[PDB]
Amino acid sequence: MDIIFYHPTFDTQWWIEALRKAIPQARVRAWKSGDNDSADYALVWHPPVEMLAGRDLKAVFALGAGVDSILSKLQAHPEMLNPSVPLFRLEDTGMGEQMQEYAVSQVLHWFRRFDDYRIQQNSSHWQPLPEYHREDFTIGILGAGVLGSKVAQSLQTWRFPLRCWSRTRKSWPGVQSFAGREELSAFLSQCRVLINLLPNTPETVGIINQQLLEKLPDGAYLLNLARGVHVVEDDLLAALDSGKVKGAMLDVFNREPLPPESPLWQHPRVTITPHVAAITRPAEAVEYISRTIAQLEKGEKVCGQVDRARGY
Amino acid sequence: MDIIFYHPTFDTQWWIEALRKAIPQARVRAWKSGDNDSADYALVWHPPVEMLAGRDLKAVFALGAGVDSILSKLQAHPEMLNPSVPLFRLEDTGMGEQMQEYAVSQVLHWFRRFDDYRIQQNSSHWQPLPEYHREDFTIGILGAGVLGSKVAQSLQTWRFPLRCWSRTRKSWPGVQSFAGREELSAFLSQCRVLINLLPNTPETVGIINQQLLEKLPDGAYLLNLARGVHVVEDDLLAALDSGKVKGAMLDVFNREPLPPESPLWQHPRVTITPHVAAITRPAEAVEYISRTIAQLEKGEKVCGQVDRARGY
């Protein structure tokens, strides 16, 4: 087999060599403009149309969890990826645990009122605060996928009430499963903490807006770990200023880097991280890719596969 | 049986009634100065010498995890508590989980560099930071008791390397156990995060001082959940200012409320909470007390028992 690799910023030389070692019968090369030699598999992030167009690839592996960008490019350039070509993404490969670290830390942080204690510390003010209780701290997860489920799991340990929202029904024993737009209002109504792990799709763009935030209980918290386009930033600022939302921690933004003019930077109840919630673990990604290729070859049934019609 | 109850600040009436219901053959009363009627058991916090002196009680239950204060008072007033009287404290009764919430939240917070990202947010500065790795993030727990073990357990989930320090050897499978002063230097040498869950005793007063902090790896973090007297605050400020300690989160202080003149309040790498790490859960405390009384009565072997000679 022949494998072509393209990534705008990764250590191309490291990846190529790691893939050779993990698939020793594989000839692996970095794709450059003009390379129209044969390829069986393509490993890509933000690929040029030229790299894929007209290739009857056996599979394409997106080097990310999200496939927002590549699907949107195929819409604009249908010539780019023949419908025969199966599209895979990176499922977990270490991002699950990273999402769990971030959510558990911050849910507990809000639950123990470390935000209030920091404000009082800023005035040298010593004042014990009433403890919150779990019954009033339901955690809702928008999106119940590879990452949502991992996060739900790691929060169940702490005995918070849990609910999730998705297109289709889930069976997780401790987690009340809400499905479809018809059930979104009910889902939102009890969510003291709302965690966004949705994919970026036309159906979810701007879903976190005024109408959604108004259905939340008062003094809610928002943790956006998914995509910036899910949030209407001005509606969120209004919810923060009205006290509807007590705190928001955001890792992703409509424009990244978030430009200095955004009021989010200096807003008091907002915490910002620069899209670092869960990054690729290269060795685990190389493991997932070689394993998937091996499974495709043995005719075994494989899962981590994008549905282009569905959008994710 | 007759039970006398004293607490300077708790809801005396609630506690009395809850104890009646949990021990329905018990006559329970609030102790007031001059009450020299008979008592079988005394439930106390910061008790007047008069309340206990000369009583041949069947047991005394301190309504706290720490027995610093009551043992120090018996030193000053040996007439207060006959050596025949067994002394119990509150073991766990919900404080374990509270310690786990606080430690897991904050260990993860430092491990994901949320402190650095907050500083960059304060300048509207967008800059992804190199991820820390577990091998460089050994967590050491000073004190390996009811609370230390609970905290160790909840951190093992996250795959941090773990070590604990105590007087006597521990057997916890994933946790390297250090014992005695002769092994303290070795224990400290790898501790990226140091968590203090020691009791307040003459042997541990001021243990966190210049000599201890110097043995820590650079860029260490201190989480003091035990007693303020364990820390020499000026040595810690010097370690913070030299960069030896990257961050400290403190719940307990030599003087509480921490007076406004302390430099800890406004120091940049210091986080303060007003002694709220783990508070009594009254219903669970009433459960532990009635259960222990029942066990003492059945001649069953009981554990949660202070060794007055040892100091804890």
Ligand SMILES: NC(=O)c1ccc[n+]([C@@H]2O[C@H](COP(=O)([O-])OP(=O)(O)OC[C@H]3O[C@@H](n4cnc5c(N)ncnc54)[C@H](OP(=O)(O)O)[C@@H]3O)[C@@H](O)[C@H]2O)c1
């Ligand atoms: N911040 C970061 O660093 C970072 C890192 C990695 C990933 N991410 C983001 O996290 C996202 C989720 O990753 P994942 O691996 O968990 O994706 P996934 O496994 O595909 O799960 C997506 C979930 O969203 C639900 N969903 C999709 N469209 C929906 C709709 N219209 N209504 C209701 N629910 C809908 C799906 O429902 P069904 O189960 O019913 O299909 C599914 O449960 C990625 O798409 C990426 O944008 C961010």
Ligand SMILES: NC(=O)c1ccc[n+]([C@@H]2O[C@H](COP(=O)([O-])OP(=O)(O)OC[C@H]3O[C@@H](n4cnc5c(N)ncnc54)[C@H](OP(=O)(O)O)[C@@H]3O)[C@@H](O)[C@H]2O)c1
């Ligand atoms: N911040 C708060 O809100 C809060 C709440 C509750 C408790 N606390 C504090 O937490 C402390 C610990 O509670 P706990 O229930 O875990 O106590 P514990 O079960 O009695 O455990 C104490 C541990 O400290 C160790 N230790 C005692 N003296 C030592 C010495 N000289 N050298 C080395 N190790 C020593 C003991 O060693 P061995 O196992 O060898 O005996 C034991 O492992 C309490 O005393 C209290 O001060 C604080």
Ligand SMILES: NC(N)=NCCCC(=O)C(=O)O
């Ligand atoms: N795991 C760490 N430290 N970064 C994640 C992605 C970087 C990468 O794959 C490359 O640039 O070669």
Ligand SMILES: NC(N)=NCCCC(=O)C(=O)O
């Ligand atoms: N969209 C761009 N440029 N980077 C995303 C990287 C991490 C992530 O969120 C994922 O892999 O899904």
Ligand SMILES: NC(N)=NCCCC(=O)C(=O)O
């Ligand atoms: N659990 C909560 N909310 N506080 C802890 C101790 C208060 C208490 O026991 C009393 O004053 O009666």
Ligand SMILES: NC(N)=NCCCC(=O)C(=O)O
């Ligand atoms: N020492 C005083 N006044 N209060 C302590 C209360 C909580 C605690 O740390 C414990 O129960 O050990």
